[PDB]
Structure 1
Amino acid sequence: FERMENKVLDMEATSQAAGELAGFGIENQFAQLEASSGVEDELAALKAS
């Protein structure tokens, strides 16, 4: 069980590995802020129609 717990920490480490790799995108992320606000603005106009 103790050696298997160390193997469970490989899954935890793999989850953080994907999070650190996703962190490379933070400079580009500003495009997602403008895209998301834009779709809510036209969706609000569509809901108001």
Structure 2
Amino acid sequence: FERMENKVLDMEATSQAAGELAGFGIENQFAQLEASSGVEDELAALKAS
């Protein structure tokens, strides 16, 4: 069980690998600020109609 748990932490380590990939996504993230405001702007127009 203990050695299998050490093997299970290979999946946990793989989760941090996706987190480092996401780090590049944090530099790219400014596009999400314009994307999020845009969907609320047309949604506000749709609600006002």
Q: TM-score, normalised by structure 2?
A: 0.86
Q: Which runs of 4+ in 1 moved over 6 A?
A: none
Alignment RMSD, CA only? 0.9
Unaligned stretches of 5+ residues in structure 2? none
Q: CA deviation at 1:37?
A: 0.8
The Cα offsets for residues 1-49 of structure 1, whole Å up to 9 and x where unpaired, read as 0111001111111111101111112222101111111111111110121
% same residue: 100
Q: TM-score, normalised by structure 1?
A: 0.86
Instruction: Count matched residues.
Output: 49
Match of 2:44 in 1: 44
**Distance across 2 between alignment mates of 1:26 and 1:41:** 24
Unaligned stretches of 5+ residues in structure 1? none
